[PDB]
Amino acid sequence: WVIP
Amino acid sequence: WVIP
Amino acid sequence: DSCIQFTRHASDVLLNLNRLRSRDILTDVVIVVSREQFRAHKTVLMACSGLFYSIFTDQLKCNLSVINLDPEINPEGFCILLDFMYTSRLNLREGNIMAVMATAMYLQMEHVVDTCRKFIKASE
Amino acid sequence: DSCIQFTRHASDVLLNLNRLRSRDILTDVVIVVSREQFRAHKTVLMACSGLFYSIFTDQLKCNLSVINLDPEINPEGFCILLDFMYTSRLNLREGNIMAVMATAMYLQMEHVVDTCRKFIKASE
């Protein structure tokens, strides 16, 4: 999961 | 396009 | 093999499937979550959820155009997860995390359940 | 928005759609390319090809379960492009590049047409  |  | 691969292809396919959903093109099922209705493509639901994979591989259920979910399922939680299926982006907030995690457990979306558990653990 | 994003989601969705295709699950169209038949999902074809997008948004054609392509289309070229749609990988070879490029032009798959043109230019 990432900060888009 | 890339070499997978 | 000796194939070449287009890096952005999968993301571009998903973006187009979300555009078809927006425009109600070739949607073939309605998911009912109490008083709310959500239109979607059976194939996208099956590709994202262990529950929908089991439903639409069943010889009788594969033919239904309407699926009613358990009354305990929160429509907002379902809406957030449906948006995730079509976009890869999860609108996870302090006010919805419990409903989202409960819905992801029911739909059998292991990666979502995993991130919800981690965000809850960090708050404790 | 304040969303989080799962990097591998789009690739995982496409992998599952290819698994449904392999197992002939919820395929809803047959594409005929002379003596050969190819089963696929209308939504995946529309998400990848400008030609299929135009066909399945047409009020009469959206209901057909069989689509016959132009007799000049090479079945091997079509097979390579269908595999690309479901996997992001293009099996481009000296012996098939002309048929693949001609098929991609017909199907309106601009990124494939672009790589074929570049590989042909490098050989000249």
Ligand SMILES: O=C1Cc2cc(Nc3nc(Cl)ncc3F)ccc2N1
């Ligand atoms: O957490 C999850 C997400 C998920 C999706 C699927 N989907 C499919 N699985 C296979 Cl093997 N082939 C085709 C499919 F559409 C099954 C189980 C699970 N569990």
Ligand SMILES: O=C1Cc2cc(Nc3nc(Cl)ncc3F)ccc2N1
């Ligand atoms: O080279 C290409 C690939 C391609 C795909 C599509 N697909 C769709 N386009 C839109 Cl805007 N919404 C939904 C779709 F399924 C249209 C044109 C083109 N041209």
Ligand SMILES: [Cl-]
């Ligand atoms: Cl997931």
Ligand SMILES: [Cl-]
């Ligand atoms: Cl393309």
